[PDB]
Amino acid sequence: EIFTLQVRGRERYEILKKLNDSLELSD
Amino acid sequence: GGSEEIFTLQVRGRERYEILKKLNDSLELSDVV
Amino acid sequence: SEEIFTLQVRGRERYEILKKLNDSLELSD
Amino acid sequence: EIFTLQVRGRERYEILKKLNDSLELSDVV
C-alpha cells in the first residue's frame, strides 16, 4: 500500500523524506 | 502562512504514513520548519 | 510539571531535526 | 558529537525515540 503526503516547504519535505527513507531501511 | 512550495512524498505502508502524517500535521500547525 | 525524558542524539543535524520535531509537537499537542 | 535532547512527557518521547532509533540503524542523517 502506497500513500502520498503533500508536504509544504523545501526543508520540511527534505526532513520528512529523510525520516521516510530511514524507516524504510530500519523497519 | 508558511512556505508556498509543495512537494509530494510517497510512503509505503499505513503505519509509516500515519507517523509521517502526524509529524506533517504538527508542523503545519506549529510552523516550526 | 510534565516529566522530562532524554535522548542521546548522534550528530548536530540529526539533533536539530529531532529538536524541531519536539518543539513542533509541543506546540501542536 | 552527542547531543542531549530533553523531551516533556511520554507521548512525545516515544515518537522521538522511535525516530532516533531508526536513524541510528539507517544513518540517513
mmCIF file of all heavy atoms in Angstrom, chain A residues 22 25-27, chain C residues 14, chain D residues 18-28:
data_model
loop_
_atom_site.group_PDB
_atom_site.id
_atom_site.type_symbol
_atom_site.label_atom_id
_atom_site.label_comp_id
_atom_site.label_asym_id
_atom_site.label_seq_id
_atom_site.Cartn_x
_atom_site.Cartn_y
_atom_site.Cartn_z
ATOM 1 N N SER A 22 14.719 6.566 6.266
ATOM 2 C CA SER A 22 15.261 5.906 7.464
ATOM 3 C C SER A 22 14.369 4.751 7.906
ATOM 4 O O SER A 22 14.855 3.644 8.177
ATOM 5 C CB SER A 22 15.406 6.905 8.613
ATOM 6 O OG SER A 22 16.057 6.318 9.723
ATOM 7 N N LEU A 25 14.530 1.685 5.724
ATOM 8 C CA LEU A 25 15.740 0.905 5.956
ATOM 9 C C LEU A 25 15.739 0.198 7.300
ATOM 10 O O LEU A 25 16.212 -0.941 7.394
ATOM 11 C CB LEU A 25 16.990 1.783 5.823
ATOM 12 C CG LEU A 25 17.289 2.264 4.403
ATOM 13 C CD1 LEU A 25 18.314 3.388 4.404
ATOM 14 C CD2 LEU A 25 17.765 1.112 3.528
ATOM 15 N N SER A 26 15.206 0.850 8.329
ATOM 16 C CA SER A 26 15.255 0.291 9.680
ATOM 17 C C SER A 26 14.122 -0.692 9.997
ATOM 18 O O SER A 26 14.310 -1.589 10.829
ATOM 19 C CB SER A 26 15.289 1.407 10.728
ATOM 20 O OG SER A 26 14.047 2.079 10.789
ATOM 21 N N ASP A 27 12.968 -0.542 9.342
ATOM 22 C CA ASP A 27 11.794 -1.379 9.645
ATOM 23 C C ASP A 27 11.966 -2.815 9.125
ATOM 24 O O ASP A 27 11.134 -3.681 9.397
ATOM 25 C CB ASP A 27 10.495 -0.777 9.067
ATOM 26 C CG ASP A 27 9.968 0.423 9.872
ATOM 27 O OD1 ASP A 27 10.382 0.620 11.036
ATOM 28 O OD2 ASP A 27 9.115 1.171 9.328
ATOM 29 N N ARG C 14 21.142 15.759 12.916
ATOM 30 C CA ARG C 14 20.154 14.832 13.476
ATOM 31 C C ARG C 14 19.487 15.444 14.722
ATOM 32 O O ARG C 14 18.255 15.414 14.862
ATOM 33 C CB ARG C 14 20.797 13.488 13.817
ATOM 34 C CG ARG C 14 19.815 12.399 14.205
ATOM 35 C CD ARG C 14 20.480 11.075 14.558
ATOM 36 N NE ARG C 14 21.217 10.502 13.435
ATOM 37 C CZ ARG C 14 21.965 9.397 13.491
ATOM 38 N NH1 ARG C 14 22.093 8.703 14.614
ATOM 39 N NH2 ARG C 14 22.602 8.981 12.409
ATOM 40 N N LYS D 18 11.489 6.493 18.714
ATOM 41 C CA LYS D 18 11.333 5.657 17.514
ATOM 42 C C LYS D 18 12.137 6.218 16.353
ATOM 43 O O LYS D 18 12.826 5.479 15.642
ATOM 44 C CB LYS D 18 9.857 5.481 17.135
ATOM 45 C CG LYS D 18 9.602 4.698 15.848
ATOM 46 C CD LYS D 18 8.121 4.377 15.681
ATOM 47 C CE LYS D 18 7.829 3.631 14.381
ATOM 48 N NZ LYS D 18 8.454 2.282 14.302
ATOM 49 N N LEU D 19 12.047 7.531 16.153
ATOM 50 C CA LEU D 19 12.774 8.171 15.062
ATOM 51 C C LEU D 19 14.284 8.093 15.269
ATOM 52 O O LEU D 19 15.032 7.806 14.328
ATOM 53 C CB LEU D 19 12.334 9.622 14.873
ATOM 54 C CG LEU D 19 10.866 9.818 14.485
ATOM 55 C CD1 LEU D 19 10.529 11.295 14.467
ATOM 56 C CD2 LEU D 19 10.531 9.180 13.143
ATOM 57 N N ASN D 20 14.737 8.392 16.486
ATOM 58 C CA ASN D 20 16.155 8.336 16.796
ATOM 59 C C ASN D 20 16.714 6.928 16.585
ATOM 60 O O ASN D 20 17.780 6.759 15.992
ATOM 61 C CB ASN D 20 16.405 8.808 18.229
ATOM 62 C CG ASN D 20 17.870 9.125 18.513
ATOM 63 O OD1 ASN D 20 18.531 9.805 17.735
ATOM 64 N ND2 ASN D 20 18.361 8.680 19.669
ATOM 65 N N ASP D 21 15.983 5.924 17.062
ATOM 66 C CA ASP D 21 16.392 4.530 16.905
ATOM 67 C C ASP D 21 16.483 4.172 15.418
ATOM 68 O O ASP D 21 17.413 3.497 14.990
ATOM 69 C CB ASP D 21 15.387 3.601 17.589
ATOM 70 C CG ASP D 21 15.528 3.569 19.104
ATOM 71 O OD1 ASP D 21 16.531 4.079 19.647
ATOM 72 O OD2 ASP D 21 14.628 2.979 19.748
ATOM 73 N N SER D 22 15.526 4.648 14.630
ATOM 74 C CA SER D 22 15.542 4.388 13.187
ATOM 75 C C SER D 22 16.775 4.997 12.532
ATOM 76 O O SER D 22 17.471 4.334 11.760
ATOM 77 C CB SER D 22 14.283 4.929 12.514
ATOM 78 O OG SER D 22 14.356 4.764 11.098
ATOM 79 N N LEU D 23 17.034 6.264 12.855
ATOM 80 C CA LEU D 23 18.187 6.984 12.335
ATOM 81 C C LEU D 23 19.519 6.362 12.727
ATOM 82 O O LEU D 23 20.458 6.367 11.923
ATOM 83 C CB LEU D 23 18.126 8.456 12.758
ATOM 84 C CG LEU D 23 16.998 9.237 12.068
ATOM 85 C CD1 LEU D 23 16.686 10.526 12.816
ATOM 86 C CD2 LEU D 23 17.359 9.535 10.614
ATOM 87 N N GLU D 24 19.612 5.827 13.946
ATOM 88 C CA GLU D 24 20.833 5.122 14.351
ATOM 89 C C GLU D 24 21.068 3.869 13.513
ATOM 90 O O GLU D 24 22.212 3.535 13.175
ATOM 91 C CB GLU D 24 20.798 4.783 15.831
ATOM 92 C CG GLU D 24 20.817 6.039 16.671
ATOM 93 C CD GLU D 24 21.520 5.893 17.986
ATOM 94 O OE1 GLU D 24 21.720 4.752 18.440
ATOM 95 O OE2 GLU D 24 21.873 6.938 18.568
ATOM 96 N N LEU D 25 19.986 3.185 13.159
ATOM 97 C CA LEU D 25 20.104 1.981 12.336
ATOM 98 C C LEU D 25 20.382 2.297 10.862
ATOM 99 O O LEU D 25 21.140 1.575 10.202
ATOM 100 C CB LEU D 25 18.840 1.131 12.462
ATOM 101 C CG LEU D 25 18.652 0.447 13.817
ATOM 102 C CD1 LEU D 25 17.223 -0.048 13.968
ATOM 103 C CD2 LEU D 25 19.650 -0.689 13.988
ATOM 104 N N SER D 26 19.775 3.369 10.347
ATOM 105 C CA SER D 26 19.873 3.686 8.914
ATOM 106 C C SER D 26 21.049 4.604 8.559
ATOM 107 O O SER D 26 21.602 4.506 7.463
ATOM 108 C CB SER D 26 18.578 4.344 8.443
ATOM 109 O OG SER D 26 18.477 5.650 8.969
ATOM 110 N N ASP D 27 21.381 5.508 9.482
ATOM 111 C CA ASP D 27 22.392 6.560 9.298
ATOM 112 C C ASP D 27 22.113 7.493 8.101
ATOM 113 O O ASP D 27 23.043 7.985 7.456
ATOM 114 C CB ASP D 27 23.796 5.942 9.209
ATOM 115 C CG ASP D 27 24.886 6.853 9.773
ATOM 116 O OD1 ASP D 27 24.576 7.817 10.513
ATOM 117 O OD2 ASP D 27 26.071 6.582 9.481
ATOM 118 N N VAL D 28 20.835 7.759 7.833
ATOM 119 C CA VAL D 28 20.434 8.632 6.706
ATOM 120 C C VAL D 28 20.862 10.097 6.927
ATOM 121 O O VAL D 28 21.159 10.827 5.965
ATOM 122 C CB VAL D 28 18.910 8.519 6.431
ATOM 123 C CG1 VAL D 28 18.412 9.628 5.521
ATOM 124 C CG2 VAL D 28 18.587 7.156 5.822
#
